[PDB]
Design an enzyme around this catalytic site. Structure first.
Site, PDB file in Angstrom:
ATOM      1  N   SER A  85      95.875 113.634  13.930  1.00  0.00           N
ATOM      2  CA  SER A  85      96.905 114.734  14.134  1.00  0.00           C
ATOM      3  C   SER A  85      96.091 116.092  14.169  1.00  0.00           C
ATOM      4  O   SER A  85      96.719 117.016  14.873  1.00  0.00           O
ATOM      5  CB  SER A  85      98.096 114.763  13.151  1.00  0.00           C
ATOM      6  OG  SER A  85      98.575 113.628  12.940  1.00  0.00           O
TER       7      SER A  85
ATOM      8  N   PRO B 159     103.373 105.679  19.273  1.00  0.00           N
ATOM      9  CA  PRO B 159     103.695 104.254  18.892  1.00  0.00           C
ATOM     10  C   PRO B 159     103.036 104.086  17.460  1.00  0.00           C
ATOM     11  O   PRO B 159     101.918 104.596  17.153  1.00  0.00           O
ATOM     12  CB  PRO B 159     103.360 103.253  20.113  1.00  0.00           C
ATOM     13  CG  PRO B 159     103.002 104.111  21.068  1.00  0.00           C
ATOM     14  CD  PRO B 159     102.733 105.408  20.645  1.00  0.00           C
TER      15      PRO B 159
ATOM     16  N   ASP C  45     116.707 126.135  17.830  1.00  0.00           N
ATOM     17  CA  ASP C  45     115.936 126.382  16.700  1.00  0.00           C
ATOM     18  C   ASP C  45     115.109 125.329  16.221  1.00  0.00           C
ATOM     19  O   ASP C  45     116.035 124.632  15.623  1.00  0.00           O
ATOM     20  CB  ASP C  45     116.762 127.218  15.655  1.00  0.00           C
ATOM     21  CG  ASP C  45     116.120 127.723  14.464  1.00  0.00           C
ATOM     22  OD1 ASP C  45     114.997 127.426  14.304  1.00  0.00           O
ATOM     23  OD2 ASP C  45     116.888 128.213  13.409  1.00  0.00           O
TER      24      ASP C  45
ATOM     25  N   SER D 174      94.701 110.574  19.700  1.00  0.00           N
ATOM     26  CA  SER D 174      94.322 109.161  20.240  1.00  0.00           C
ATOM     27  C   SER D 174      94.845 108.010  19.173  1.00  0.00           C
ATOM     28  O   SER D 174      95.204 106.855  19.441  1.00  0.00           O
ATOM     29  CB  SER D 174      93.006 108.853  20.365  1.00  0.00           C
ATOM     30  OG  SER D 174      92.215 108.988  19.186  1.00  0.00           O
TER      31      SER D 174
ATOM     32  N   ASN E 149      95.843 106.798  14.685  1.00  0.00           N
ATOM     33  CA  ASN E 149      95.347 106.957  13.302  1.00  0.00           C
ATOM     34  C   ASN E 149      95.264 105.538  12.852  1.00  0.00           C
ATOM     35  O   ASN E 149      95.193 104.949  11.645  1.00  0.00           O
ATOM     36  CB  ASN E 149      96.122 107.515  12.306  1.00  0.00           C
ATOM     37  CG  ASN E 149      96.011 109.003  11.757  1.00  0.00           C
ATOM     38  OD1 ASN E 149      95.127 109.484  12.144  1.00  0.00           O
ATOM     39  ND2 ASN E 149      96.853 109.799  11.609  1.00  0.00           N
TER      40      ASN E 149
ATOM     41  N   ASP F 297      93.048  99.081  15.021  1.00  0.00           N
ATOM     42  CA  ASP F 297      93.893  99.214  16.336  1.00  0.00           C
ATOM     43  C   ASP F 297      93.357  99.795  17.480  1.00  0.00           C
ATOM     44  O   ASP F 297      92.116 100.241  17.484  1.00  0.00           O
ATOM     45  CB  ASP F 297      94.935 100.367  16.070  1.00  0.00           C
ATOM     46  CG  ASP F 297      96.176  99.946  17.069  1.00  0.00           C
ATOM     47  OD1 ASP F 297      96.426  99.262  17.733  1.00  0.00           O
ATOM     48  OD2 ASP F 297      97.294 101.210  17.040  1.00  0.00           O
TER      49      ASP F 297
ATOM     50  N   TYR G 198     100.796 106.403  25.811  1.00  0.00           N
ATOM     51  CA  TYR G 198     100.610 107.727  25.782  1.00  0.00           C
ATOM     52  C   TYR G 198      99.269 108.137  25.894  1.00  0.00           C
ATOM     53  O   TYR G 198      98.789 109.109  26.546  1.00  0.00           O
ATOM     54  CB  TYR G 198     101.316 108.426  24.519  1.00  0.00           C
ATOM     55  CG  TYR G 198     102.725 107.969  24.491  1.00  0.00           C
ATOM     56  CD1 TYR G 198     103.074 106.576  23.970  1.00  0.00           C
ATOM     57  CD2 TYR G 198     103.726 108.926  25.119  1.00  0.00           C
ATOM     58  CE1 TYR G 198     104.383 106.418  23.898  1.00  0.00           C
ATOM     59  CE2 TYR G 198     105.128 108.351  25.094  1.00  0.00           C
ATOM     60  CZ  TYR G 198     105.492 107.207  24.525  1.00  0.00           C
ATOM     61  OH  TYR G 198     106.517 106.820  24.448  1.00  0.00           O
TER      62      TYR G 198
ATOM     63  N   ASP H 159     106.679 117.737  17.742  1.00  0.00           N
ATOM     64  CA  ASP H 159     106.595 117.269  16.547  1.00  0.00           C
ATOM     65  C   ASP H 159     107.795 117.271  15.737  1.00  0.00           C
ATOM     66  O   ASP H 159     108.922 117.191  16.259  1.00  0.00           O
ATOM     67  CB  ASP H 159     105.452 118.184  15.784  1.00  0.00           C
ATOM     68  CG  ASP H 159     104.678 117.112  14.963  1.00  0.00           C
ATOM     69  OD1 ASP H 159     105.335 116.920  13.815  1.00  0.00           O
ATOM     70  OD2 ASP H 159     103.455 116.767  15.083  1.00  0.00           O
TER      71      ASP H 159
ATOM     72  N   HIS I  19     104.575 118.334   9.285  1.00  0.00           N
ATOM     73  CA  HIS I  19     103.449 118.065  10.090  1.00  0.00           C
ATOM     74  C   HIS I  19     103.229 118.991  11.336  1.00  0.00           C
ATOM     75  O   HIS I  19     102.252 119.515  11.852  1.00  0.00           O
ATOM     76  CB  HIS I  19     103.755 116.514  10.626  1.00  0.00           C
ATOM     77  CG  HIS I  19     102.547 115.989  11.382  1.00  0.00           C
ATOM     78  ND1 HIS I  19     102.831 115.610  12.917  1.00  0.00           N
ATOM     79  CD2 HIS I  19     101.454 115.345  10.798  1.00  0.00           C
ATOM     80  CE1 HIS I  19     101.720 114.980  13.070  1.00  0.00           C
ATOM     81  NE2 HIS I  19     100.823 114.563  12.002  1.00  0.00           N
TER      82      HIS I  19
ATOM     83  N   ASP J 213      90.214 136.929   8.388  1.00  0.00           N
ATOM     84  CA  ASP J 213      91.197 136.185   7.594  1.00  0.00           C
ATOM     85  C   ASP J 213      90.413 135.620   6.635  1.00  0.00           C
ATOM     86  O   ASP J 213      89.225 135.092   6.488  1.00  0.00           O
ATOM     87  CB  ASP J 213      91.862 135.209   8.314  1.00  0.00           C
ATOM     88  CG  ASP J 213      92.427 135.898   9.735  1.00  0.00           C
ATOM     89  OD1 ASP J 213      91.748 136.225  10.345  1.00  0.00           O
ATOM     90  OD2 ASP J 213      93.576 135.783   9.774  1.00  0.00           O
TER      91      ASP J 213
ATOM     92  N   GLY K 222      94.014 131.278   7.838  1.00  0.00           N
ATOM     93  CA  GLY K 222      92.734 131.275   8.794  1.00  0.00           C
ATOM     94  C   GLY K 222      93.184 131.697   9.835  1.00  0.00           C
ATOM     95  O   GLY K 222      94.282 132.586  10.071  1.00  0.00           O
TER      96      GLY K 222
END
Ligand SMILES: [Ca+2]
Ligand SMILES: [Ca+2]
Ligand SMILES: [Ca+2]
Ligand SMILES: [Cl-]
Ligand code: NA
Ligand code: NA
Ligand code: NA
Ligand code: NA
Lengths: 5, 473
Positions: B260, B148, B73, B185, B187, B193, B200, B45, B86, B7, B104
């Site tokens: 993500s 969250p 859908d 885990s 951002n 944080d 979660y 997502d 996303h 690719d 890729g």
């Protein structure tokens, strides 16, 4: 927002 | 005889393979014959572009649903700002088609890929539960790059329906072997944080995955906590390369970034592992991750060796996933013994926190009982406490083998006076240790302020088994 990306 | 993908953007997928050894060792798994065939991954997502040139060949409507609009859908809702790109980016990391002259390749480029459109709307407890509990005897692995808010003052986790979905998934999903839940885990690095304030990632039923930059550093967005299990590469500064994946509107992007991107790569590696042994339970999978992940050349100031000789960091868990090692170890894996749970109520009276509190307790971990644990898996300190400014607290838990887990680091933005209400701080850092002996909980005020509060409950919850240990590393 309660949940975010 | 194995021919790597042709690719056009595969040479830019530095995290899949390189001579540098700054990679996830995914080509070594492909060469052993594992590309994801027969494994089903669902991306929870904002939707998936199911007609994307690099996803259509692997797309699985059986792994997909639209919970936001209640239809089958999961097509993203197109907007000028491309807000709903996303999930499509996450999907291509798992299972973008190989050898098709487009973009890729996914880690598991012959796996089947679906998406649940559930973030494009109000994300309620019921929305999460219907997504996590989607088709649990068809989907093997669920990937979630959401959670969250990362403002550094939130303490939040799954409410009742979502927690029920986790338990139903690991108990009855995948033929009773248990759904695999992979979680990003977080951002919230810039906000200082902690991913232990996120139920979660903090869950024992999810594999929480952190990020490393190309040069082996802790990215700006990274959250440190003791519940993280392992790490995959993602983005860093602007001299470091980023993640190559499918983009909205049938495009290719070389600039997918953040926490993500790490969970989907882990989900792909786990897909390869399930192909190597379809009989792995949800706990088997976490054992494999612990035993095969690699600290080498990941830079952190907090690497520590636990009681069985494994290096562990709050930024990285047990280190970088190693796909080749995962699939090799999975092939002759012996199923772990049934999970035991030992509940130890530590306090006999409430304790004022003041400037510093240390609670020591020598435990037998259910000696003489069927839930006797000599091989720890997850450990939780379920704490109930009041305090006037929550973010000034730091909380540490020391195992009998001397492993010091940071359950909670200072959060400068957390001004809350709400304390913690039976919050289950979780650590993976004492995995495989014998939990018998002295545990130490430390609660300290990291500020110069005259803070005040009371610890009213400390339940030490141990999970694990009593058989099958390896010689320590
Ligand atoms: Ca729809
Ligand atoms: Ca491709
Ligand atoms: Ca967070
Ligand atoms: Cl439980
Ligand atoms: Na089961
Ligand atoms: Na977890
Ligand atoms: Na001991
Ligand atoms: Na001691």
């Amino acid at each position: 927002r309660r949940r975010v990306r | 005889v194995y021919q790597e993908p042709t690719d056009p953007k595969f040479p830019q997928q530095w995290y899949l393979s390189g001579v540098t050894q700054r990679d996830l060792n995914v080509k070594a798994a492909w060469a052993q014959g594992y590309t994801g065939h027969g494994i089903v991954v669902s991306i929870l997502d904002d939707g998936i572009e199911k007609n994307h040139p690099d996803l259509a060949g692997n797309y699985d409507p059986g792994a997909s649903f639209d919970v936001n609009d209640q239809d089958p859908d999961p097509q993203p809702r197109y907007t000028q700002m491309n807000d709903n790109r996303h999930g499509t980016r996450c999907a291509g990391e798992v299972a973008a088609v190989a050898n098709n002259g487009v973009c890729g390749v996914g880690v598991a480029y012959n796996a089947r890929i679906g998406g649940v459109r559930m973030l494009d709307g109000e994300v309620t407890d019921a929305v999460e539960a219907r997504s996590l509990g989607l088709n649990p005897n068809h989907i093997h692995i669920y990937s979630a790059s959401w959670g969250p808010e990362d403002d550094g003052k939130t303490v939040d986790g799954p409410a009742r329906l979502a927690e029920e979905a986790f338990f139903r998934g690991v108990s009855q999903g995948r033929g009773g072997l248990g759904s695999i839940f992979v979680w990003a885990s977080g951002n919230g690095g810039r906000e200082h944080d902690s991913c232990n304030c996120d139920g979660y990632t903090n869950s024992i039923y999810t594999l929480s995955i952190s990020s490393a930059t190309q040069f082996g550093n802790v990215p700006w967005y990274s959250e440190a906590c003791s519940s993280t299990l392992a790490t995959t590469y993602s983005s860093g500064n602007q001299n470091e390369k980023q993640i190559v994946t499918t983009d909205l509107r049938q495009k290719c992007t070389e600039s997918h970034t953040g926490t993500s991107a790490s969970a989907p790569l882990a989900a792909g590696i786990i897909a390869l592992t399930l192909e190597a042994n379809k009989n792995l339970t949800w706990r088997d999978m976490q054992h494999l991750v612990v035993q095969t992940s690699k600290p080498a050349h990941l830079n952190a100031n907090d690497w520590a060796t636990n009681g069985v000789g494994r290096k562990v960091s709050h930024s990285y868990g047990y280190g970088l996933l190693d796909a080749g090692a995962m699939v090799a170890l999975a092939q002759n894996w012996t199923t772990v013994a049934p999970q035991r749970k030992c509940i130890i109520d530590i306090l006999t009276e409430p304790k004022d926190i003041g400037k510093r509190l240390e609670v020591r307790k020598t435990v037998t971990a259910c000696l003489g009982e069927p839930n006797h644990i000599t091989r720890l898996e997850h450990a939780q300190a379920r704490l109930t406490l009041s305090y006037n400014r929550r973010g000034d607290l730091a909380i540490h838990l020391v195992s009998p083998m001397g492993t010091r887990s940071t359950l909670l680091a200072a959060r400068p933005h957390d001004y809350s006076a709400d304390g913690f209400n039976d919050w289950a701080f979780m650590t993976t850092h004492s995995w495989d240790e014998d939990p018998s002996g002295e545990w130490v909980l430390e609660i300290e005020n990291t500020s110069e302020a005259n803070n005040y509060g009371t610890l009213t409950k400390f339940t030490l919850v141990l999970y694990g088994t009593a058989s099958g240990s390896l010689v320590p590393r």
